[PDB]
Amino acid sequence: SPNSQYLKTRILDIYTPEQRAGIEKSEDWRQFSRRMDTHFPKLMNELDSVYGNNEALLPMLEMLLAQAWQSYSQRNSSLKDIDIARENNPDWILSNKQVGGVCYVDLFAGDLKGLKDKIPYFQELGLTYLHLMPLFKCPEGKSDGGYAVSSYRDVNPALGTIGDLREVIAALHEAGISAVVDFIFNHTSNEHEWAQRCAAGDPLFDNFYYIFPDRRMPDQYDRTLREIFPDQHPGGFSQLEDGRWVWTTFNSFQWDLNYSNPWVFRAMAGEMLFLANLGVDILRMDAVAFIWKQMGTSCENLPQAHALIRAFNAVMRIAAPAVFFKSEAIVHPDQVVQYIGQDECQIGYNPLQMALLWNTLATREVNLLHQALTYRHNLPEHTAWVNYVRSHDDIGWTFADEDAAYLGISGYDHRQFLNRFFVNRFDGSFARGVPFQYNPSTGDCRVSGTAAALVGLAQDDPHAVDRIKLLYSIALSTGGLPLIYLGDEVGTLNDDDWSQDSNKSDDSRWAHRPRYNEALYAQRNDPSTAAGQIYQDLRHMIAVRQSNPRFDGGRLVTFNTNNKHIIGYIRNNALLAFGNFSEYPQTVTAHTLQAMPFKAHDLIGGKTVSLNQDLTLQPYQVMWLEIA
Ligand SMILES: OC[C@H]1O[C@@](CO)(O[C@H]2O[C@H](CO)[C@@H](O)[C@H](O)[C@H]2O)[C@@H](O)[C@@H]1O
């Protein structure tokens, strides 16, 4: 294997002697050279574990590094300052000051210029992080909400131009808001040039995807492949018009990229640099679990997948230190955590917590949630969870069967219950969700619907508003970077048109992808409306979180409340949080509280509370007691 010094000398070989001398003394080169020495060993090691003695590895590597230098050289000075800042503050992601939001540019603000006009609102809300959904060119009609990319460089014309995106990102930074976008690296649309040329037989794009002559191998692979959208097609393959079959983990119009080919990594790494230089702060690593395939395995979470992401991580450490990764791994808890590491994905969605928040609202029992916060919350140094209540996707019950077994709970039976409850097919349910991907051959099913629709706000359940505050209070205080599904802060309901839109009717996820509700946002300052109540509540908690140091970091210690309906935890040994998931008053006995100070101030309600006597919480009430 070649070393950093060797490769760097060859990188400089493109310059004339006179030029070279100049570069070798430049500041940019000094920084690039230093990072090369520090991080290249990791990049080489990761790529070697995956590609081994592949003849294309060395050539691809040198091509990628030359590209990395040009990219870093061209990188804007202001971005380089951020590189230096984060390179020296790896825990910026763990700060209590961070609070994020996510929205579709078209649905929330019309277009990019329109989104720029919303920035003042984002500041009003207190956001320091904004994830904008898929912005680039995609097939018209059906594109999986933009996740079927036809071009990584050309902005969706309906949203604006690449120039508009640059301005948006610049304006976000001016507003103290990091920009977060998707890095859809597991697949492209079947209309992407690479796909067309690969399928057409262009030798330059040979093996850029997985294409088979017939069902022989597809049938063998399908013996162990999980179905993500069984509604769209069985197994993981789709048939071409010419009869061949291509790997399509998701929709038929989304073709899985072939990372067993070194040139594919190089291609995507080039796309990462492009995004990096636009000023992106965090890249949402879409479908990280699926980037490596191996006959006989589930083709998820394989070793090479992790190795590749660590390789990608190394490239940013070298050519754009400010760019961090957000892992999207909605899988088994044991698998979810493996993507999180300073050298892999510094942060990642925490589906376990999100899933259990909803579970607890249904069962009124915090057992599973307590278990999770107790044994699966804390993370390695320099990494953090992205805690959320809802997302652009359905809700999957990804808790661990093994964990549930410890508590005497049957995973399969429990999910059947949860599914029925949230789609209003259970007596007394307050939820008004919609089914998503019911798989007849497995019994699995997910749930679609907005936070408000799932808590009963559609029918005006008097407990709806409090349930929302409760769910969000936990994502906001357990430790990690909280993410607000923009629209939830005013109690936005489901979209009542998607079911009849032929481009959406077969994807119930559009039920919880409503447009900006002008009427609800116009009520956010009125305490008599649900929108105002929800808004002022969330805004208050956001304010408290960002200003109070007791919330800093991502570590927590659970507290036994001795009440199966009340969750309890302590942050920094100074903030004691209680959450009542029962629609009835619930009590934490004075006996249970004997070790606590006699009185404590509650940041939620603002009152001083007595802990030397039974503490009775109102239905769905949450308390943030300062115990130190
Ligand atoms: O249920 C309404 C509507 O949802 C769609 C689109 O996602 O399918 C979902 O619901 C069906 C019936 O409950 C499930 O069988 C299916 O698996 C699930 O995705 C539409 O097909 C249906 O009309």
- Give the CATH number, domain containing residue 241: 3.90.400.10
Backbone dihedral angles phi then psi of residue 486, each to the nearest 5 degrees? -45, 125
- Do 129 and 194 belong to one domain? no
Binding residues, by number, are 144, 187, 254, 284, 392-393, 509
Sign of the dihedral defined by the CA atoms of residues 391, 397, 398, 400, in that order: positive
User: Which residue from 434, 445, 505, 508 has its CB within 8 A of the most atoms of ligand 1, so it is best to mutate?
Assistant: 508
Q: Show binding-site residues for substrate.
A: 144, 187, 254, 284, 392-393, 509
- 286 noted as active-site residue: yes
Which of 548, 383, 534 shows the shortest CA–CA distance to 470?
534
Report the distance separating Cα 510 and Cα 450, nearest Å. Answer: 10
Query: Which amino acid is present at 512?
Result: H
Q: With a 6 A CB cut-off, is 433 part of the ligand 1 pocket?
A: no
What is the position in ligand 1's atom list of the atom closest to the CA of 506?
A: 6
User: Active site residue: 191, 281, 300, 328, which one?
Assistant: 328
* Gap from CA of 94 to ligand 1 centroid (Å): 39
Q: Which of 223, 190, 206 is nearest to 294 (CA)?
A: 223
According to DSSP, the residues that pair with 622 across neighbouring strands are 579
Structure tokens at 110: 């019309």
The DSSP bridge partners found for residue 446 are 436
Q: What angle do CA 282, 288, 291 make, to 5 degrees?
A: 130
CA dist., res. 277 & res. 319, Å (int) = 10
> In this structure, are 550 and 433 located in the same domain?
yes
Query: Is 328 part of the annotated catalytic residue set?
Result: yes
Looking up tokens 């029992």 gives 365
Among 212, 229, 258, the domain-final residue is: 258
Helix (H, G, I), strand (E, B) or coil at 228: coil
The CATH number assigned to the domain holding 522 equals 3.20.20.80
**Cα–ligand 1 centroid distance for 509 (angstroms):** 10
Nearest to 397 by CA among 450, 452, 360: 360
Output DSSP code: residue 211.
Answer: E
Render 41-75 in DSSP notation, one character per residue.
HHHHHHHHHHHTT-TTHHHHHHHHHHHHHHHHHHS
Q: What's 293-307 look like in SS3?
A: CCCCCCCCCCHHHHH
Which of these is catalytic: 46, 106, 281, 286? 286
DSSP label at 326? E
- Nearest-angstrom CA–CA distance, 323 and 321: 6
Q: Which atom of ligand 1 is nearest to the CA of 230?
A: 17
Verify that 119 and 253 share a domain, yes or no.
no
User: How many angstroms separate the CA atoms of 395 and 354, rounded?
Assistant: 9
Distance between CA atoms of residues 272 and 569, nearest Å: 39
Cα distance between residue 244 and residue 198, in whole Å: 13
Q: Which amino acid is at 43?
A: L
Substitution candidate for ligand 1 out of 144, 227, 228, 231 with most atoms within 8 A of CB? 231
Cβ of 281 closer than 6 Å to ligand 1, yes or no, is: no
Same domain, 274 and 353: yes
| CA of residue 510 to ligand 1 center, whole Å | 12
The residue whose CA is least distant from atom 3 of ligand 1 is: 508
User: 355 C-alpha to center of ligand 1: Å?
Assistant: 21
Say if residues 494 and 450 touch (Cβ distance below 8 Å). yes
Long-range contacts of 193-198 (CB under 8 A, 24+ apart): 193/151, 194/267, 195/255
Atom 11 in ligand 1: residue holding the nearest Cα: 435
How many CB atoms are located within 10 Å of the residue 45 CB? 15
Element (H, E) at 531: helix 530-547
The whole domain housing 578 covers: 555-628
User: What is the domain-level CATH number for residue 16?
Assistant: 1.10.1740.10
Taking the C-alpha atoms of residue 327 and residue 385, their distance in angstroms, rounded to an integer, is 9
Token digits for 527?
């305490």
Rounded distance, CA 231 to CA 442, Å? 13
Quick one: 410 and 389 in the same domain? yes
Q: Do residues 176 and 144 both lie within one domain?
A: yes
> Are 103 and 237 in a shared domain?
no
Report the distance separating Cα 563 and Cα 274, nearest Å: 52
CA atoms of 596 and 211, how far apart (whole Å) = 64
Amino acid found at 614: D
What is the rounded CA–CA span in Å between residue 87 and residue 307? 22
Among 204, 223, 258, the domain boundary falls at 258
C-beta of 231 in contact with ligand 1 (< 6 A): yes
Mark whether 242 and 209 lie in a shared domain.
Answer: yes
Distance 233 CA to ligand 1 centre (A): 14
Q: Which atom of ligand 1 lies nearest, measured to the CA of 439?
A: 17
Alpha-carbon distances, residue 172 vs 106, 159, 220, 342, 444 (angstroms): 17, 17, 48, 25, 40
* Claim to verify: residue 182 and residue 287 sit in the same structural domain: yes
Nearest CA residue ID for atom 21, ligand 1 = 506
Q: What method was applied to determine this entry?
A: X-ray
Q: Which atom of ligand 1 is nearest to the CA of 445?
A: 17
Of 524, 554, 584, the last residue of a domain is: 554
Together in a domain, 496 and 407: yes
Q: Residue 448 Cα, ligand 1 centroid: separation in angstroms?
A: 10
Q: What residues form DSSP beta bridges with 566? A: 580
- Longest Cα–Cα distance of the chain, Å, equals 81
Start-to-end C-alpha separation, the chain? 55
Q: Are residues 451 and 477 in the same domain?
A: yes
- Backbone Cα Rg of the chain: 25
- Resolution of the experimentally solved model in angstroms: 2.1
Give strand pairing partners of 571: 575
Is 232 found in the same domain as 349?
Answer: no
Minimum CA distance residue for ligand 1 atom 15: 438
- Nearest ligand 1 atom to the CA of 509 is 7
Nearest CA, atom 12, ligand 1:
435
CB 222 within 8 A of CB 234: yes
Helices (H), 75-111: 77-87, 105-109
Domain CATH number, residue 563: 2.60.40.1180
Distance 434 CA to ligand 1 centre (A): 8
Angle between helical axes of 27-51 and 262-278 (0-180°, round to 10): 150
Q: How far apart are CA 346 and CA 339, in angstroms?
A: 8
**Residue 51: Cβ within 10 Å count:** 23
395 CA from centroid of ligand 1 (Å): 14
Total structural domains within the chain = 4
Tokens, residue 398: 């990804």
Identify the residue whose C-alpha is closest to ligand 1 atom 14. Answer: 438
